[PDB]
């Protein structure tokens, strides 16, 4: 049921979720909304290259999407991310 401790690097009112095959996304549990951008993190700077801020953490893989938009694959929660693991956490 209810549990608390450490936030999953996400703003207030939102909740991270995964699509059928494990696609991480940001949903508004309140209005069942679905968006790709993370609120806590800026709009302009969403797809950042952590390589300049710090190495990728355990359980992760960096890649590029067809449009050339890099992402990451976390093998901790078995999913694919859009925003960096450190971005949201600053």
């Amino acid at each position: 049921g209810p549990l608390g401790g450490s936030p999953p690097d996400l703003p207030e009112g939102y909740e991270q979720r995964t699509t059928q095959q494990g696609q991480v996304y940001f949903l508004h549990t309140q209005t069942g909304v679905s968006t790709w951008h993370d609120p806590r993190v800026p709009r302009d700077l969403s797809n950042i290259n952590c390589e300049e801020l710090g190495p990728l953490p355990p359980g992760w893989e960096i890649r590029n999407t067809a449009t050339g938009r890099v992402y990451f694959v976390d093998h901790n929660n078995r999913t694919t991310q859009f925003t960096d693991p450190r971005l949201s956490a600053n």
């Binding site: 095959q21 494990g22 696609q23 996304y25 992402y71 694959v73 991310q81």
Partner: peptide, 20 residues
């Protein structure tokens, strides 16, 4: 074929590797 939204498909679903 459209999967989701008009053109909003950035991070590919999970499976250790970009699985369609």
């Amino acid at each position: 074929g459209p999967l989701g939204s008009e053109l909003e498909s950035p991070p590919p679903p999970y499976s250790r590797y970009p699985m369609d």
